[PDB]
Every structure is written in structure tokens, then in C-alpha cells.
Amino acid sequence: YTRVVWCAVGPEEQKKCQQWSQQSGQNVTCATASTTDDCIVLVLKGEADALNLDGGYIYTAGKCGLVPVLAENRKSSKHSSLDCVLRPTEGYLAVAVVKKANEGLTWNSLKDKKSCHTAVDRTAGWNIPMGLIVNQTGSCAFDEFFSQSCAPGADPKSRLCALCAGDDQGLDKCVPNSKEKYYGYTGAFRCLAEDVGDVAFVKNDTVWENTNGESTADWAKNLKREDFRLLCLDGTRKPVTEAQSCHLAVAPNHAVVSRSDRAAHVEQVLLHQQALFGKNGKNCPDKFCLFKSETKNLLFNDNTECLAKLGGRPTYEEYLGTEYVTAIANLKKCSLEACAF
Ligand SMILES: *[C@@H]1O[C@H](CO)[C@@H](O[C@@H]2O[C@H](CO)[C@@H](O[C@@H]3O[C@H](CO)[C@@H](O[C@H]4O[C@H](CO)[C@@H](O[C@H]5O[C@H](CO)[C@@H](O[C@H]6O[C@H](CO)[C@@H](O)[C@H](O)[C@@H]6O)[C@H](O)[C@@H]5O)[C@H](O)[C@@H]4O)[C@H](O)[C@@H]3O)[C@H](O)[C@H]2NC(C)=O)[C@H](O)[C@H]1NC(C)=O
Ligand SMILES: *[C@@H]1O[C@H](CO)[C@@H](O[C@@H]2O[C@H](CO)[C@@H](O[C@@H]3O[C@H](CO)[C@@H](O)[C@H](O)[C@@H]3O)[C@H](O)[C@H]2NC(C)=O)[C@H](O)[C@H]1NC(C)=O
Ligand SMILES: *[C@@H]1O[C@H](CO)[C@@H](O)[C@H](O)[C@H]1NC(C)=O
Ligand SMILES: OC[C@H]1O[C@@H](O)[C@@H](O)[C@@H](O)[C@@H]1O
Ligand SMILES: [Fe+3]
Ligand SMILES: [Zn+2]
Ligand SMILES: [Zn+2]
């Protein structure tokens, strides 16, 4: 009864959740799903209590009645005096990244190039870029803009999946979990880094966390920030240090969602779990760090300082903000009220 059930997406997050469970003395327990969507369903059904979601997915969840509870918060210079849990959430930047070596490639020369997406329905990896591409294009046939792509979640036999690779064996191609080589913020960036795609739609933080020896993963080891560039909307290319004047949009933080009739009990049990396994907990270094998964963003983004109270009891539209909610609406008519389930 004072026990939360977490939904994990893919085998790798189940292994992280079970590990969390053991350390929690069953205060927390796990359910597994092959995708975020089924995870949401499990939550509607009541078979699981919560998960942490990217904005794009929250939108979905919110039509189905789920509610944002706590948000991911990361480090900052502004607001310093404030404790992380109470500090407001700053947001994150969706940027388009390309190889410097790849000269002359601008936002305007994107037609027919190869693209790398975090996964379909996500904010930075999908909703923003295609939103804009649709708008500028007048067409809804965004499935034809890029000659080939890796957009996890799309029809595997489509070209949107042409660039995805599956796991060790090439099984599970294009599934939207971390089983797919190019899935998620990291996969997407790995996709470009290895020159599979010409372009990767990921957040700003991702370029910085995988270059200049920040990641140590064999494909990330030798990567150098200066070999990358950002695509601006004025069709101009800037270094990755100019994110603030060359981004596609600022996204709302990933956050934990739950059923409204459970939000209270999830919030409660969670803040206490963060006291223990969070950035500065009784047991982080030593036994288990909720926000570490080694460059993999499992359960939570790896750069999370803490999970923050929301303050102002946000309904999801409010949490996502009117700007973003519209950009999502206009995109969805291509392919306005429901529970997609
Ligand atoms: C775009 O997104 C990026 C990514 O989030 C933002 O860059 C981060 O922004 C914050 C605040 O602006 C930076 O501020 C610092 O926060 C640091 C903690 O991350 C603190 O810095 C200490 O520790 C850092 C690493 O954790 C490290 O940062 C830098 O320095 C070295 C080399 O210069 C590198 O990291 C090394 O240290 C770690 C130790 O944990 C080690 O494991 C590694 O092997 C490296 O040897 C790294 O390249 C990085 O450049 C410093 O060593 C420092 O001692 C500090 O408290 C400070 O407040 C933060 O550093 C940025 N993160 C990164 C990866 O650099 C950026 O804000 C965004 N920009 C826009 C426009 O939005
Ligand atoms: C794709 O194209 C659509 C069609 O225009 C874009 O929608 C438009 O976006 C702006 C800002 O989000 C809306 O303006 C707002 O209107 C209210 C009053 O209605 C105003 O008070 C606010 O301050 C704000 O300016 C505009 O109304 C809106 N139109 C529609 C139909 O929603 C959409 O944003 C584009 N998508 C992307 C990804 O850019
Ligand atoms: C299990 O939850 C109860 C309620 O707070 C608490 O006494 C106990 O510390 C929890 N176990 C752990 C290790 O968090
Ligand atoms: O999610 C909190 C906050 O995120 C910002 O980026 C905006 O979208 C706001 O409208 C919203 O309230
Ligand atoms: Fe995201
Ligand atoms: Zn801006
Ligand atoms: Zn309100």
C-alpha cells in the first residue's frame, strides 16, 4: 500500500529497476513493457503506477488521464539559492547536429539527406523537427522528406527504419526501447557520429555528454566537439557552444507521470527514494544511484540532479505549455482529443 510499481521499457531498464527494487526492500517494484506505449497502458489498467516520460509521450498520457507528478531537474547557474527539489525546471534545447567535415549542409539542404531520430513521438527527436519540416513543407508526407532514416517506432519495413540496426544480432530492428543501437538521445547521436545519418535530432546536452572524453564508450571515446556543428533556423552553422542562439525549440523536462488517483502516493514514496539513491543520498556512491546507468539514460536521464516538485499543480497542458501543445496538434492531424488507446 505504501508500495509503488514502476514500469520499465525494455530488458535493460528492467535490469536497472529490479536492482532498484532489491535495494528498496520492495518499497518499489517493477513491470516490464516492450514500449513506452504499453507502459502507459499498464498504468491506465492499474497494473503499474508510474514512469518517467519525455514530453511527447506525456502528451499522449495526458489525453488518457495521467498526471505529471515530479520533474527531472539538472544543474544551473541561475536560481542557485534554491534547493533542487523546489527549484523551477529550466527546460532543455532541441538542436540539430551535423558533422563539421560535412560542409555546406544546412537546414535548407535537408531534403533527401539521412536522418537520426531519438524515436517517433518524442520532443527533440521527432515532434519539433518534423513539426517544422511539415509546416515549412506544406506537405504531411514527412515520411518522404528524408531519403532514409532511423526513427524508432516507425514501420520497420519503411525507410524511416532503413537506418536502424537492432541489437547484437540485428534482432528487434527499429523498436523504440534501448535495445536498438540508434534509439534514444544516445543512439541517435551514435547514429550520426558513426556517419550512418547525415543529421541527428537530439538535445544540446547530448552533444556535450558524448564528446571530449565525457562518455568513454568505444564509439564516443575519440569524439571531439569541434567536429560537430548545429543547424540553425536562419540556415547557418554554429559551433556547439552557441546552443542558445542556434536551437530548434526549448523542451519541457522529462517527468514522472501517474494516474491522478495515485499521484499523491507516488510523489511521496519517490522523494523518499531520492533521499536515498539520488545525487546526494545516504546510499548513492556506495550502494545504488538512481540517476546513474552509465551513459544510457535508463529510467531517468543520466544528467538529472534531482526530481523536482512542480508547484502550481500542473495539468499536462499547463506542464507542456501552450506553445508545445499546439505544435503537437498541428502535427497529429497529418497522421485533436482522444486516449490513443
Ligand atoms: C548545453 O548542455 C550542456 C550539457 O549539460 C551544458 O554544459 C554543462 O553545463 C553546466 C552548467 O552550465 C556546466 O557547469 C559545471 O557543472 C559541472 C558538472 O557537470 C561542474 O564542472 C565540473 O565537473 C564537470 C564534469 O562533471 C567538468 O565539466 C567540464 O570540464 C571537463 C573538461 O573541461 C570535463 O569533465 C571532466 O570531469 C569529469 C568529473 O566528473 C570527469 O568524469 C571527466 O572525465 C572529465 O575529465 C567536461 O568536458 C566538461 O567540459 C569539470 O571538470 C568541472 O570540474 C561545475 O560545477 C560547473 O558548474 C557543466 O560543466 C556542463 N557540462 C559539461 C559536460 O561540460 C550547457 O550548459 C548547455 N549550454 C547551453 C547553451 O544550454
Ligand atoms: C505549425 O503551423 C501552425 C499553424 O500556424 C503553428 O501554429 C501557431 O502557433 C502560434 C504559437 O504557438 C499560435 O499563436 C498563439 O496564439 C494565441 C492566441 O490564439 C496568442 O495569444 C499566443 O500568444 C500565441 O501567439 C498560433 O495561434 C498557432 N496557430 C494554430 C493553428 O495553432 C504551429 O506552431 C507550427 N508548428 C511548429 C512546430 O512550429
Ligand atoms: C520502505 O518504506 C518505509 C516507509 O518510509 C521506510 O521505513 C523504509 O526505509 C523503506 N525502505 C527503504 C530501504 O527505503
Ligand atoms: O513544463 C514547464 C514549462 O516548460 C516551459 O518550457 C514552457 O513550456 C512552459 O509553458 C511550461 O509550463
Ligand atoms: Fe526528450
Ligand atoms: Zn529559443
Ligand atoms: Zn492551473
Curated annotation (Swiss-Prot):
Residues 4-333 form the Transferrin-like domain. Poly-N-acetyllactosaminic carbohydrate moiety seems to be needed for TLR4 activation. It is found in: Secreted; Cytoplasmic granule. Disulfide bonds join C7-C39, C17-C30, C64-C339, C84-C306, C116-C191, C140-C334, C150-C164, C161-C174, C232-C246, C284-C289. Glycans are attached at N27, N135, N204. Hydrogencarbonate 2 binds at T118, R122, A124, G125. Fe(3+) 2 binds at D54, Y92, Y185, H254. Transferrins are iron binding transport proteins which can bind two Fe(3+) ions in association with the binding of an anion, usually bicarbonate. Lactoferricin binds to the bacterial surface and is crucial for the bactericidal functions. Has some antiviral activity against papillomavirus infection. N-terminal region shows strong antifungal activity against C.albicans. Contains two BBXB heparin-binding consensus sequences that appear to form the predominate functional GAG-binding site. Monomer. Found in a complex with LTF, CLU, EPPIN and SEMG1. Found in a complex with MPO and LTF; interacts directly with CP, allows Fe(3+) incorporation into LTF and activation of CP ferroxidase activity. Belongs to the transferrin family. This is Lactotransferrin. The gene is LTF. The chain holds residues 361 to 705 of 708 of the full protein.
